[PDB]
Each structure stands twice: as structure tokens, then as C-alpha cells.
């Protein structure tokens, strides 16, 4: 019993976790197998930001400007390569500690954890969601770019994010371990603000899902509704639209508690309409959407 | 910018995981040098848990039925002795993965990180606190005993928490690495009710100083207070009594931010007497108590 925002246990990325420099601005690598990777703007200089040409900076730049530290030994570069916004730094030594992974890119509502790092060196592990306006609520400081984004099944990591900036509002943009950032964004020092942050209502009716499963029952009532009419409230809540999809991948959840999916929803029509009149649920006073249902079911039958 | 529910990075202690069976009970050990720690209670069978008695239990048993195995290697035991409500089995080989570490009992209010195990292998990381009634609100199936809370300052890991088992209102009680319950519990299947869970105020003022920091200032007011007066309204709210040692605590948030302390204690008595008005403070429409101002500080400056 007991539900928390939980992330994967960390070691297999703190294992990978290097630090870049090149001339004066340092932050993390990601080091898989002989390639470290990293965010492309660690060849600029904070007033490069405003309109940085990458391609041309990047020429004035050869294997022995990029320094890389692993703990406390240098790594040998052998090539660089950019691909979109990251650069490949390709070393001589393979990582000893590659653990088995994948690149992955992620659909807004995924959630996965983020190891925090300065310097090369891991700081936290935190839960994040890709939130629909491709934006991830994190808590990153200057340095912190290159941190990275992943997901474990069992033993294969797949990576799916790495961070690069902070927009104007707080908020962090990032790209995949491919270089392309999600959502519109650009790695340049410029306005860049986010669209509207809905909910991502398919995870908030997973987590009621994972109250109902921890005894916190008060919200559930004696209605049901329709795809269209949920979706009608769910439109004006921003909340994401509900598909079958969703219906479908609650499937799991509605068989374990015996609420049929529908019911849920009625349920959550009913909290949008008239709150939670100072009550709480798995210990919040808001609607949480940053757990998937498969991170209920997960976290609910104790996969390790 | 940014500010999360932040665990420390989990592999240094997945490096001391392992699996302890004696007979049908399974559960997690720590292993430390060529120690493994683990709750007493693997000795027991479910319907032993009615009224054991530890020492009587124990002398059914020999060093050949603890079956300690680390990842996929059985551990040789040779030696085991019970302190308090912990076994300490000790093995025949020196985990090779021991990090620096130091076994420390924490005081309520104190926050820590959980690396929650099931046979052995770490399924999740979570930050938790030790709660004014000696409990802590965790996430723990069966056979999570014996997964471990933790801190760490830079390379030593401070051991504080071992889980031992869930409180009929779905609350974890657990002890420190030397077998110690905190708080009044034992290691039985009988009524055991947790006392009042008051707020951690200290904490919740940490927090309100993390949202200013992070541009959430909407509850910032005209007002100031002094200590009697802000306890009388604590009490009011079941929240801890606000101490000069709190205040001093509170030292270097107040210096960051420019807010004296009394002057945040007359924001939190607002914030307690009108509540929040359906407005949010760093994502929560509630008052968080499970940062303490060193992870304020921590988190706020990205310490690794
Ligand atoms: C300071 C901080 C806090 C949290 N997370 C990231 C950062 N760092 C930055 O944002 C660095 N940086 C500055 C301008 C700019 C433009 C584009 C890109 Cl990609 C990076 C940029
Ligand atoms: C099932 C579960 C979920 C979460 N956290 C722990 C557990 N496991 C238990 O509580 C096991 N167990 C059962 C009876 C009993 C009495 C005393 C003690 Cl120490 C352990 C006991």
C-alpha cells in the first residue's frame, strides 16, 4: 500500500554520466558504448546563444577542444559528429559500464525519470512526464544540460530525453538521444513560449485507478457517462481528449479494481465540476496526470 | 528553476541489494563489507507474526538456512546474530560494492530517499520523511522488507531506514540499520495505531522559501508575526511547534531570499487560516512538509 512518485533506481544511467567541455562552458555527456553524447550548444559561448551558426562554430572545433571526464580520468576523442542538436563524441575506450539500451523517442503523456547532473555528476532522480506542449516540468540549473531522460525495462534502459534549456517560464525543452528536440523548439537563446499545458487525462484516471487500489475511495459516486460527454467537460477543463486508445490501455486497471473505465470517468467529471471540497487523494489536493497506467500497474504489483 | 520531490541518485545502494530467504520467507538484506542486514521477521512464518518470539525462533535456525543471494551468486554464510530487530548474517566475501557509509538514527521531520526492493533487485526511488508519529508514507507491497531509506553527502551513504512492515491504515513503520523501530512500533501482527501525523512546519517554510526562489510569490503578504503567535495558530492546525533552532534552520533561505522568517511564518498562518483559494504553490494545492531547508538548499544550488 502506499502510492509515491516513483523513479527507476538510477545506477545503470549514473554509470554513463560523463562531463563535456569545450573552451569555457561545461556540462554532461552521456557515455554508450565508445560515443559520449551531449547538448550541441557546449560549443558556444552564452553570447553565441542569441544566433548561433552550430556548422560554423563547430569547425573552428577539432577532437582535442571537446574534454572528456569520467569520474576523474580523461577520455581520449578520437571524431565528433553533430547530428541535429547533439554532438556524438566518439572515444577510444568503450564504457565499461554500458548497461543494455536503447534511443527512444516518447509521445507527450509518457512519463520517465531524470537523472540530474552537474559536472558530470549525479545530483537526483525525479519522475517527469513529456507534458502535450512537448515541455517537461523539471528542476534543472545552469550545468545541468545533458541530463538525461530514461526509462528501464528490467535490464535495457531506453533513453528518451536530454535536457538542453529552460524556456523564459520556468519550464525545460529537450531533445531525444537523436538531437531532435520535442515540440517546436530550438536550441538559440531566443522567445520561445510554450502552448496551453493540458492534462493528460488518461493518466489522472490511472492514478484515481491507484487510489481506488490504496483505499481512497471517497470521489467514486453513483454515475457513469459517454466518450462524447466526458470529453465535452474534459474540453472545458483542458484536459486532453479521451480515445478508445486510452479506454483500451485502462483496460488493465478497470479488470483489477471491477470500475468499469466509463465509471472512472464519471467519477473525474464529477471531481473537474465541483472540486475536491478540501479533501484529498493519494495525498494531493489536485488531480495528478504525471503516472501512466503503466506506471500504476508497475508500481502497484511491484515489477523490479 | 523547477522544484521536485527529489530522491538521491539509488546506485550505491543497488550495489548492496540482496535477496535473504530462511525457509518460505523471502525478503531484501543490505549487504555491507561482509555483513547482510535484514529484518528478523524472515525467521517467520505468516501465522508465527500473531506472537513471535524472536530468540525462541531463532535457535531453529543454523547459518546454512539463511540463503542470501546477490544478484544471481549465493552468498556463504558464516555467522548470524540478531541485534534488536535486525539479523546480521555475516558472509564469507566483502561486498565488492560496499561505497563509504555510516549508519545514522534520524529525528521526525527528517527526509530521506527509499530504494524499494522486491527479492533483491530495486524496482523504485522515492523520497519520503520521517513523520512526527514515527511512521512514513511509503510505497511498499509484500515483500518489500528489508528495502532501505537512505542519505548521502557526496560519497558516504548515511543508512537510516530498513522497512519492516505496513500498519492496518496502510502507513510503514520501520527500523534504523541497528534494529531500533522509530517510534513505538514492533515487529508483530497486533493493533498498533499511529498517533496524530502533525506537520513538519520547519519543512513547509523550507518549501514556501523554495517557491520564491522558483518566482511563486503570490502568498507573500504585508504581514509579519512572532513565534508565540504563529504557534497558537499552528496548534490550531495540528503543526509542529515553531522553534528558535527551526528559525536558525531557516538562516540561509531567509538570507537568499531576502524574507526574514517571521515575516514567511505570517505567510503560512495566512495561507493556514484562508487556505489556498484554488490556487497552487509549486504544482501543489496543498503545503508540502517533505523537504527539509538543507534540501531546500541542496536542490536550489545543485549540490552532487
Ligand atoms: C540556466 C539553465 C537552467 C535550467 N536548465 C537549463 C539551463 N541552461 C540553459 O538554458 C543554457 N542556455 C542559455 C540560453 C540558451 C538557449 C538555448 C539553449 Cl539549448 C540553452 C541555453
Ligand atoms: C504486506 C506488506 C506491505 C508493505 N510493507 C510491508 C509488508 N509486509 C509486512 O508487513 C509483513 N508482515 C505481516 C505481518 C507483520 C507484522 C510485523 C512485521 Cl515487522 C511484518 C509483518
Known amino acids: 500500500s502506499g502510492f509515491r512518485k516513483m523513479a527507476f533506481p538510477s545506477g545503470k544511467v549514473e554509470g554513463c554520466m560523463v562531463q563535456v567541455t569545450c573552451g569555457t562552458t561545461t556540462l554532461n555527456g552521456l557515455w554508450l558504448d565508445d560515443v559520449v553524447y551531449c547538448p550541441r550548444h557546449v560549443i558556444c559561448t552564452s553570447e553565441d546563444m542569441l544566433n548561433p551558426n552550430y556548422e560554423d562554430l563547430l569547425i573552428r572545433k577539432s577532437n ?54 552537474y559536472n558530470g555528476s549525479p545530483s537526483g532522480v525525479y519522475q517527469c512526464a513529456m507534458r502535450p506542449n512537448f515541455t517537461i516540468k523539471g ?70 485507478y491507484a487510489a481506488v487500489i490504496n483505499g481512497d475511495r471517497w470521489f467514486l459516486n453513483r454515475f457513469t457517462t459517454t466518450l462524447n460527454d466526458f470529453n465535452l467537460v474534459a474540453m472545458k477543463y483542458n484536459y486532453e481528449p479521451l480515445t478508445q486508445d486510452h479506454v483500451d490501455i485502462l483496460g488493465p486497471l478497470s479488470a483489477q479494481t471491477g470500475i ?23 495525498g494531493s489536493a489536485l488531480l495528478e496526470d504525471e503516472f501512466t497506467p503503466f506506471d500504476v500497474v508497475r508500481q502497484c504489483s511491484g515489477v523490479t
Open 64 to 117: 582535442h577542444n571537446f574534454l572528456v571526464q569520467a569520474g576523474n580520468v580523461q577520455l581520449r576523442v578520437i571524431g565528433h559528429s553533430m547530428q541535429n542538436c547533439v554532438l556524438k563524441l566518439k572515444v577510444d575506450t568503450a564504457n565499461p559500464k554500458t548497461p543494455k539500451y536503447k534511443f527512444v523517442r516518447i509521445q507527450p503523456g509518457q512519463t520517465f525519470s531524470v537523472l540530474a547532473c
Open 139 to 208: 528542476s534543472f540549473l545552469n550545468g545541468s544540460c545533458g541530463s538525461v531522460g530514461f526509462n528501464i525495462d528490467y535490464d535495457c534502459v531506453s533513453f528518451c530525453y536530454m535536457h538542453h534549456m529552460e524556456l523564459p517560464t520556468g519550464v525545460h525543452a529537450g531533445t531525444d538521444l537523436e538531437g531532435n528536440f520535442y515540440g517546436p523548439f530550438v536550441d538559440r537563446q531566443t522567445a520561445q513560449a510554450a502552448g496551453t499545458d493540458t492534462t493528460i487525462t488518461v493518466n489522472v484516471l490511472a492514478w484515481l
Open 260 to 282: 468499469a473505465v466509463l465509471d472512472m470517468c464519471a467519477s473525474l467529471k464529477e471531481l473537474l465540476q465541483n472540486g475536491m471540497n478540501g479533501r484529498t487523494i493519494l
